Every structure is written in structure tokens, then in C-alpha cells.
Amino acid sequence: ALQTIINARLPGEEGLWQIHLQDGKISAIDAQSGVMPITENSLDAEQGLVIPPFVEPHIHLDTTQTAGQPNWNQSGTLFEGIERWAERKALLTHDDVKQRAWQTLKWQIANGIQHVRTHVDVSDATLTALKAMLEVKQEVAPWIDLQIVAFPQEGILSYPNGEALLEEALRLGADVVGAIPHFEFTREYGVESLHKTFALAQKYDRLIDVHCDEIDDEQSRFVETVAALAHHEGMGARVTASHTTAMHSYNGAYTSRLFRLLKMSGINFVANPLVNIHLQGRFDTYPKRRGITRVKEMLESGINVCFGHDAVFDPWYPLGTANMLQVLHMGLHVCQLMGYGQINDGLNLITHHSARTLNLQDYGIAAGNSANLIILPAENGFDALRRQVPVRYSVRGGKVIASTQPAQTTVYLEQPEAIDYKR
Amino acid sequence: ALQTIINARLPGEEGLWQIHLQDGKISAIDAQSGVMPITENSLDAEQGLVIPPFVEPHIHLDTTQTAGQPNWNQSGTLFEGIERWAERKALLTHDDVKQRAWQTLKWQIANGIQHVRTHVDVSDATLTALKAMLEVKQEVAPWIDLQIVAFPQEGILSYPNGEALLEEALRLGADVVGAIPHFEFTREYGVESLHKTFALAQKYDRLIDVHCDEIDDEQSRFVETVAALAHHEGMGARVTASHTTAMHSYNGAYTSRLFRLLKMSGINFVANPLVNIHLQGRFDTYPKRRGITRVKEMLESGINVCFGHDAVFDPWYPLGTANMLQVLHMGLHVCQLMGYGQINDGLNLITHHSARTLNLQDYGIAAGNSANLIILPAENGFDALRRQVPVRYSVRGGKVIASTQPAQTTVYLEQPEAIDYKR
Numbered sequence: 001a002l003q004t005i006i007n008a009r010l011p012g013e014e015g016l017w018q019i020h021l022q023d024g025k026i027s028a029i030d031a032q033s034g035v036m037p038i039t040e041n042s043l044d045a046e047q048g049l050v051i052p053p054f055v056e057p058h059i060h061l062d063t064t065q066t067a068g069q070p071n072w073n074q075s076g077t078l079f080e081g082i083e084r085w086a087e088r089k090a091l092l093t094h095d096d097v098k099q100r101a102w103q104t105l106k107w108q109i110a111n112g113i114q115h116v117r118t119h120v121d122v123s124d125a126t127l128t129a130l131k132a133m134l135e136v137k138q139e140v141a142p143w144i145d146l147q148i149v150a151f152p153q154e155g156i157l158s159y160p161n162g163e164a165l166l167e168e169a170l171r172l173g174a175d176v177v178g179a180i181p182h183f184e185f186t187r188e189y190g191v192e193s194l195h196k197t198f199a200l201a202q203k204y205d206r207l208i209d210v211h212c213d214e215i216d217d218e219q220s221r222f223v224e225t226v227a228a229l230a231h232h233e234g235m236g237a238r239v240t241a242s243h244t245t246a247m248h249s250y251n252g253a254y255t256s257r258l259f260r261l262l263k264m265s266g267i268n269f270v271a272n273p274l275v276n277i278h279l280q281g282r283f284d285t286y287p288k289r290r291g292i293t294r295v296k297e298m299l300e301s302g303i304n305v306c307f308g309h310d311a312v313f314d315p316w317y318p319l320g321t322a323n324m325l326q327v328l329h330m331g332l333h334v335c336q337l338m339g340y341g342q343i344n345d346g347l348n349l350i351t352h353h354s355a356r357t358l359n360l361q362d363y364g365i366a367a368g369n370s371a372n373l374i375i376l377p378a379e380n381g382f383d384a385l386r387r388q389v390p391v392r393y394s395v396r397g398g399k400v401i402a403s404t405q406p407a408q409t410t411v412y413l414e415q416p417e418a419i420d421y422k423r
Numbered sequence: 424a425l426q427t428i429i430n431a432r433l434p435g436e437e438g439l440w441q442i443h444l445q446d447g448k449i450s451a452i453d454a455q456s457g458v459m460p461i462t463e464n465s466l467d468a469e470q471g472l473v474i475p476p477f478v479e480p481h482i483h484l485d486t487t488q489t490a491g492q493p494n495w496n497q498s499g500t501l502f503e504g505i506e507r508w509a510e511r512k513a514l515l516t517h518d519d520v521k522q523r524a525w526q527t528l529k530w531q532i533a534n535g536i537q538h539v540r541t542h543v544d545v546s547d548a549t550l551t552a553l554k555a556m557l558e559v560k561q562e563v564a565p566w567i568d569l570q571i572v573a574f575p576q577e578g579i580l581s582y583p584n585g586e587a588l589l590e591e592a593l594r595l596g597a598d599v600v601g602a603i604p605h606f607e608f609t610r611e612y613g614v615e616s617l618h619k620t621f622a623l624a625q626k627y628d629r630l631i632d633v634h635c636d637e638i639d640d641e642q643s644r645f646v647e648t649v650a651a652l653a654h655h656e657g658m659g660a661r662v663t664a665s666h667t668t669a670m671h672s673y674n675g676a677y678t679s680r681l682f683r684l685l686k687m688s689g690i691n692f693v694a695n696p697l698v699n700i701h702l703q704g705r706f707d708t709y710p711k712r713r714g715i716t717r718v719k720e721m722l723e724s725g726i727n728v729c730f731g732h733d734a735v736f737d738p739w740y741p742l743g744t745a746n747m748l749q750v751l752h753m754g755l756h757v758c759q760l761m762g763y764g765q766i767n768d769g770l771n772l773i774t775h776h777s778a779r780t781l782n783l784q785d786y787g788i789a790a791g792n793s794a795n796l797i798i799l800p801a802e803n804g805f806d807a808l809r810r811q812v813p814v815r816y817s818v819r820g821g822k823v824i825a826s827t828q829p830a831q832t833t834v835y836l837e838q839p840e841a842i843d844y845k846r
């Protein structure tokens with residue numbers, strides 16, 4: 001079994017490091033004064049970057065891999081996506097959900113993602129997707145720790161037996177309580193749904209992740225209730241507000257007032273760059289707003305924010321390979337976090353900040369933690385992001401669970417020359 | 424020498440095709456009724472997609488590869504970029520420009536780009552970068568047909584001897600006349616500069632490519648003069664309006680009136696997604712506009728529009744590997760061209776439409792044309808874009824000039840499994 005990771009670079013640290021492994025955990029981390037020789041039981045990072053696993057804080061595995069079945073969304077709109085999904089209803093079975101969820105999970109394993117939070121639609125009396133996902137969670141456990149959010153897609157108060165189904169999902173084992181206040185029939189139902197959501201989370205000791213204000217409506221301010229209730233219950237760490245795209249459209253004075261509460265509450269925020277840029281701003285003609293939440297300002301204020309892929313190869317987002325560096329690339333551009341340091345520190349948005357959002361207790365390259373880490377063939381976060389590098393090795397419990405042999409590019413000039421896209 | 428390309432898929436066509444080569448040209452193209460066996464002198468596309476070479480219609484090779492030298496742009500702003508570039512002035516020499524231009528050109532060759540249009544700053548009495556680029560053009564000719572735009576970055580009428588230097592650049596061999604009307608001191612200088620630009624293009628029989636209305640100013644309408652002058656001279660095919668980001672902010676009524684002229688004029692448009700999303704909208708707080716020209720509407724109106732990378736690894740854009748599928752990916756998202764067909768047809772924005780913009784006369788997979796083509800290991804444009812595939816082979820004059828052995832990813836579950844990110 002592997003005993004050491006050598007010649008490792010670490011974010012924010014100078015030089016090379018050696019990570020000692022014992023009994024599936026990191027026993028010690030020591031600096032090196034030079035390059036160490038390879039040997040049996042040593043995994044050579046080759047001066048590449050070693051980081052804790054990538055995290056997917058927000059994805060919908062119940063709808064993944066269904067784009068084009070039976071027809072393609074040709075307009076690319078949300079409306080048509082709903083219709084295309086409805087045409088596939090006859091194929092939505094227990095086995096179908098498991099098969100598609102596993103397909104995307106395999107892409108995630110290949111992409112060094114060892115933690116995934118999936119939302120599952122529970123506005124279905126049969127809870128078909130949920131039952132399937134609970135089995136998938138057990139099956140994929142050796143490679144990925146999967147959290148399941150009971151997501152009442154059609155609303156809690158605006159759908160028949162919505163609250164009862166949400167609670168049933170928790171009784172069956174869902175890890176997180178979801179909600180969608182802006183989709184409820186009225187603002188009052190929206191606020192009330194949040195009180196019910198928090199009551200359920202406290203009753204069952206579960207986390208909370210609300211699809212919050214995902215709409216270009218400057219009056220959609222459910223985020224203040226999410227933050228206020230979290231602060232009241234002293235449970236900010238266990239709470240997440242996903243999307244909050246409406247915040248992109250708030251006036252600055254209200255946003256400034258709100259930010260004080262957001263910081264005090266300690267809640268987490270998830271932005272989904274690939275889907276937000278695609279689905280937001282659809283009611284604008286020109287100019288067209290970007291529609292991503294205030295990521296830059298959150299970072300400047302010390303508010304925890306991270307990035308999710310949201311959807312992969314489905315009616316609402318036809319693209320994706322479940323790659324977090326790709327999600328990060330889109331977010332840095334749309335949020336204008338393009339300074340060198342902002343880009344370099346970007347890795348935090350798909351690693352540490354996301355681990356905090358999932359309330360993970362065993363995460364990070366530190367003595368005592370499980371030996372879960374990945375190796376990127378790049379010098380730092382900036383380099384990894386610029387070159388969209390693959391994951392050279394993914395290690396879990398001190399064992400390699402994924403590896404990618406890099407592509408080899410050659411140009412034939414007066415003489416053949418290898419191209420690695422580095423200067 | 425290669426005699427045939429077999430098992431090739433072609434955009435918009437059904438089945439597989441065989442492309443016969445003779446004397447460096449495509450002699451004939453015949454459909455296949457099944458998979459053909461490989462053999463000596465046959466390049467097997469392996470049911471991958473064969474297309475004419477990728478094109479880079481807008482890049483700045485004179486500033487490429489300079490990010491972080493001597494310092495990094497930490498704010499990521501245009502303003503700081505100017506200051507960071509100024510700090511490197513002592514390193515701006517003939518050899519330095521050639522070295523950096525060649526570095527990016529090699530990345531382009533590796534990425535299947537055989538046609539490149541580079542703008543070169545000619546607001547320099549010594550014309551240092553231009554002299555260097557003219558040598559680079561000759562040196563890279565076996566692999567890339569490089570067009571040089573004499574770009575008067577500081578203005579034609581607003582910079583000392585600006586017009587004289589622009590003409591000197593043409594007398595030295597620049598292929599295209601550039602301009603930047605919105606940067607001139609006054610609207611009047613802007614309009615006058617365009618008359619001077621067109622006069623020079625007609626005097627020397629050169630193409631035109633204007634950095635046009637690259638500013639979030641709803642009153643910046645120099646594009647109407649570019650189109651009107653082209654129509655008057657009957658030279659639309661030889662004219663290009665780069666950027667036109669101001670169009671993102673025009674009212675709809677004026678835009679509708681303008682579009683009639685744009686279509687009638689026949690001029691070309693270049694949008695630069697990666698840089699536009701980064702540099703536009705910087706004077707907005709929230710909401711923030713996207714700032715890309717009206718690509719979707721141009722396509723719907725039959726107006727030729729294409730995508731450029733603009734900058735690579737410099738003070739104005741720190742990222743990039745000179746990859747056109749990456750540029751396309753960003754543009755499809757920001758312009759909301761996310762329907763299946765829109766994404767699949769996306770390849771036109773980095774191939775055929777760009778060739779038209781460069782007024783290329785030998786481009787496309789057709790009998791009689793030079794055997795210049797590339798092979799993507801994907802089923803169609805949608806697949807190539809989704810998976811951000813590399814260029815398996817780049818062929819020029821019937822000879823392989825670049826090749827990429829794909830990365831190999833394996834996940835170790837109960838048994839090892841190869842992952843190709845296809846469903």
C-alpha cells in the first residue's frame with residue numbers, strides 16, 4: 001500500500017512537500033528542501049499540485065444524462081426543457097435513475113470529485129427517484145460520499161401533500177432538507193415554507209439547502225429569511241442558500257444591509273456558473289444581465305461561497321462532463337475574478353469552500369485526516385485552471401481510485417516538437 | 424504520402440465519407456456505405472469528424488505570453504493591464520516579439536488552427552512589433568497563413584503621425600487596415616478616421632478590420648459608418664467590424680434599422696467571448712451586462728459573425744491556450760445559443776464563418792481545394808464542444824503537421840474501467 005506522496009506542491013505554500021500515509025490516514029506532512037527520489041510505495045506528485053478532493057456541492061443526478069431523450073431541446077429554453085422531460089416520463093424508472101446517476105458519478109470519480117451533494121425531486125408521491133438515489137448512495141460510498149437533498153421542486157405549500165412528502169423523504173434518509181420559496185404561489189407561502197423547512201431540519205437534525213431566489217426578480221428576497229432563521233437557531237454552518245441569482249439584480253443599498261446579516265448568520269452560498277449564465281437573463285432583451293449571485297463581494301466580505309455544476313447533459317443544461325475546473329473557469333469569467341490572485345485562489349471555490357458548504361468533518365491535507373487527496377499536473381491553481389488539466393491521480397483512503405495519463409500533443413515543424421501549453 | 428482520409432463524418436451530412444487526396448489537394452469526396460478498412464497511405468478518421476482547419480480571426484500576437492512580466496495584473500482591470508505592460512517596455516525587442524508570437528503560434532498549430540489574423544500595434548514610430556511580425560509571417564507560412572492587421576491602437580487622428588504610420592505599415596506589407604474610432608478624441612475624428620481607413624484599403628487593395636465600438640456606450644455607432652462605406656465601395660466581403668460590444672447596449676429600434684444596412688453591406692463581424700465577458704460591463708455595478716455583440720440575431724439574419732480568442736496569456740487576458748473550442752464554449756453560453764442545433768452548428772463560428780471573415784479563397788472540404796483539414800475525435804459539433812476534444816490530426820497540403828494522442832482516464836471500481844465521458 002502507498003506510504004508516501006512526494007514532491008507535492010500545496011496551495012499558498014512555498015516549495016515541495018512530503019505527505020506520509022498510515023492506516024488510510026495522513027500521518028504527517030513535512031517540507032522537502034529539494035526533489036525526493038521515487039521508490040516503492042511512493043506516489044510521485046512530480047512537483048504537481050496536491051489538494052483535498054474536488055467537491056460537487058450542487059447537482060441533479062435524478063435528471064442527468066437525459067438530454068435528447070426522446071427529443072432534443074432545440075430552443076434551449078427552460079420552458080422547452082420542461083416539455084422535453086415530460087416526453088421521457090415513460091422511461092423514468094428505478095433502474096433508469098440508478099443507471100444515469102452512476103454514469104455521471106463515474107465521470108465525477110474520474111474528475112477527482114469525492115464529495116457530491118445531489119438534489120432529488122420529492123414532489124412525487126411515489127418518490128421513485130429518491131428510492132433509487134438512496135441505493136446509489138450506498139453503492140458509490142467506497143468512492144464518493146453522496147449527500148441527498150429532499151428537493152420539493154413543485155413547492156412545499158403549493159403542491160399536494162408537499163410538506164408530508166418532504167418529511168417522508170427525510171424519514172427515508174435524505175441528508176438535507178430542501179425548499180424553493182420563489183416558486184411557491186405567493187410570497188407568504190414562500191416565507192412560511194422556510195419556517196417549515198427549518199422546523200424539519202431541527203426535528204431530524206439534518207442540513208438545509210434552499211433553491212433560493214433563482215429568478216431575475218429584484219423583489220425575491222427569501223435569502224434574508226434563510227439567513228435570519230439560521231441565525232436565530234444558531235445553525236448557520238448547516239445551512240446553504242443555492243443560486244440567489246436575484247441578488248444580481250438587487251439595489252446596492254439593500255444588498256449592503258443584507259450582507260451584515262449574511263456574515264453574522266454564517267450560512268453558505270452556492271453559485272452555479274454554467275447554468276446561471278445560460279438560464280438567467282432570459283427575460284431581458286439587450287442589454288442582458290449575467291445573473292450570477294454576488295460572488296466577488298461575498299469573497300471580499302468573508303462570506304462562504306462556492307461553485308456547483310448544477311446539471312449535466314439534461315434538458316435544462318445539455319452540456320458538461322462534470323468537471324469542476326470547467327465550472328470554475330466559467331465562474332471566474334462571469335464574476336470578473338480575473339486578477340492573477342483571484343484566479344489562483346479560485347481552487348478554493350471548488351474545494352475548501354464547498355467542503356464547508358457540505359459541513360464536512362474529514363477534509364483537507366492535514367495530519368489525522370483520511371488520506372483523500374488528488375494530484376493535478378500543474379504548478380498552482382492558476383496553471384491548473386488555465387490549462388484545464390485532468391486529475392493525474394485521485395487517492396481515497398490511501399489508495400488510488402482514478403488516474404489519467406495525459407494527452408500527448410506533437411507538432412511537426414522542421415523537427416517534431418512536444419507541446420504542453422506552458423511557456 | 425497520404426492518399427486517403429477514410430471513415431470521416433462531415434457536418435450536416437449523413438454517414439461516413441472518403442476523402443481522396445492527390446498532389447496536396449482534395450481530388451474527390453465519396454460517400455461510404457459502411458466502415459472502410461485501414462491500409463498504407465490511409466489516415467483513418469475512425470468515424471470522427473473531419474472539418475476544414477480552425478481559424479483565429481482576431482488575436483494580438485504582439486502582446487501574447489507577457490502576463491506576469493515583470494509583475495502580475497492583480498486587479499484584472501484594463502487600467503492595471505496598461506500599467507503592467509508599461510513596466511515591461513525594456514524587454515520589448517524584435518527577438519522578444521518573434522519568440523512570444525511563435526510560442527502562441529505553436530499552440531495554435533497544435534490546436535488545428537491553420538489561419539490566423541493578428542492585429543499589430545502601429546502607434547509606434549519604430550514599428551518594432553510590425554517588423555518582427557512580418558518575419559514571423561514568412562517563417563510560419565508552411566503551417567499557418569498569417570494575416571497582419573496594421574492596428575493604430577492609439578488612434579489615427581488622435582496620435583502623432585498616426586495616419587502616416589498606418590500607411591507606412593501598409594507599405595511594409597500589412598494585409599489589413601485597422602482603426603479604432605471609439606478611442607479617437609471625438610466622434611468627428613472617429614468618423615473621419617474611417618474615411619481615411621477605407622481610402623487606404625482601396626489605395627493598396629487591402630482588407631479592413633476595425634476595432635469597432637468596443638465600449639459599453641449606447642451612443643458609439645461607428646459600425647454604421649463601417650457598413651455604409653463598405654456598401655458604397657461595394658467591398659463588404661473585404662471588411663470586418665471587430666467587437667461591436669456597444670451593440671449589446673443599443674435600443675432595439677435603432678438596432679432593427681441598423682440590421683438592414685448590416686445585411687445589405689455584406690461586412691463581417693468578430694465577437695471575442697473570452698475577453699468581452701471579462702472586460703465589458705466593468706462600469707456597471709449590479710446588474711451587470713454581458714457585453715457581447717448581437718451574435719444570435721446576426722445568425723438569425725444571415726449576417727456573417729464568428730469568434731476570436733483576442734488575447735492569450737497577457738495583461739488584458741491572463742488565460743488561454745489558444746483553443747477555439749474553448750472560445751466557442753464561452754460564446755455559446757454568454758450568447759445563449761444553447762439549443763442542441765445551435766450548439767451543434769457552433770463549429771461554423773470557428774471555421775467557415777471565420778474563413779469568410781478572412782476572405783479566404785482556398786478553404787473547405789471540396790474537390791480542388793488544398794488538402795487542409797483536421798480530424799476531431801467526436802461524432803459531431805455538439806459532441807466535440809461538450810467534451811472539449813483535442814485535434815487528433817491536423818493535415819496541411821496532404822501532410823500531417825500535428826497530432827494528439829488522447830488522454831487515457833481509468834477509474835478503479837470493483838474492476839478498472841475506462842472513462843471517455845460519452846454516455
Ligand SMILES: [Fe+3]
Nearest residue numbers: 060119211310
Ligand atoms: Fe438545482
Ligand SMILES: [Fe+3]
Nearest residue numbers: 483542634733
Ligand atoms: Fe483586438
Ligand SMILES: [Mg+2]
Nearest residue numbers: 060310311316
Ligand atoms: Mg435547476
Ligand SMILES: [Mg+2]
Nearest residue numbers: 483733734739
Ligand atoms: Mg483588445
